[model samples]
Target: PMFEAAYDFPGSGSPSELPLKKGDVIYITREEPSGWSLGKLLDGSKEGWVPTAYMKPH
Candidate 1:
């Protein structure tokens, strides 16, 4: 999940709760009214939320 439609996840208005799954691995927080905030996601899943203006830090 480092490439190939990475951030472009199952986006589009509630795309199955589009929080990013399948070996999840998130880390992109731009605090501001929940603009984007996801931290853990590697088996020990914690936070999960995408659409951070297309995350980076590969």
Candidate 2:
């Protein structure tokens, strides 16, 4: 599903991590009760987990 980031993640340098910039459109590939979800950049180039709370359904 698609979502808009409500906050900035500032990104970790980990390849397994996706960076979140405020208002960036993203795709939530997966989600969990751990308050996190696998997020993919709208471009389909980068993907990883991010705080689910930081995203709003687009």
Candidate 3:
């Protein structure tokens, strides 16, 4: 499922990946066996781990 970022996320562990800001649309691609969700930016410019709580169904 796709989701929208609820708040600005400056990213916690990496500088290589782009951060998600409020209202950013996350194109969810996969669910991690751990906890995070794998997703790409709507612009298709960046991909990274996103916290489930940071997003909500679109």
Candidate 4:
């Protein structure tokens, strides 16, 4: 699923596994039952889990 970050996630702490600015597009490859989804950025430079609530389908 393609999604856009709803908020800034600078990876400043444990909550975010990677940094993402609002509106950055990401491709979700998998989703966990725990409300997290594993995805990569459009450029394929990185991949990690992000809170499902932090994104919306695009």
Query: Number of clashes in model 2?
Result: 0
lDDT of 1 by residue, 1-58 (tens): 3311144455456533345533444554443475654444544545445665555455
lDDT: the better of candidates 1 and 2: 2
Q: Residue 17: error of model 2 in Å?
A: 2.0
For candidate 3, give the lDDT. 0.79
| Model 2 C-alpha lDDT per residue in residues 2-48, reported as the tens digit of each score | 99988998767566667788889988878899878898777778789
Model 4 segments more than 4 A misplaced: 14-16
* Ranking according to lDDT, highest score first: 2, 4, 3, 1
Worst lDDT 10-window in candidate 1 = 1-10
Runs of candidate 3 exceeding 4 Å displacement = 16-18
**Candidates' C-alpha lDDT:** 0.47, 0.84, 0.79, 0.83
RMSD vs true structure, all candidates: 10.9, 1.6, 1.8, 2.1
Off by over 4 Å in 1: 1-9, 14-19, 38-58
- Number of the top-ranking candidate, with TM-score as the measure: 2
Give candidate 3's TM-score.
0.78
For candidate 1, give the lDDT of residue 48: 49
Candidate 2, poorest ten consecutive residues by summed lDDT:
10-19
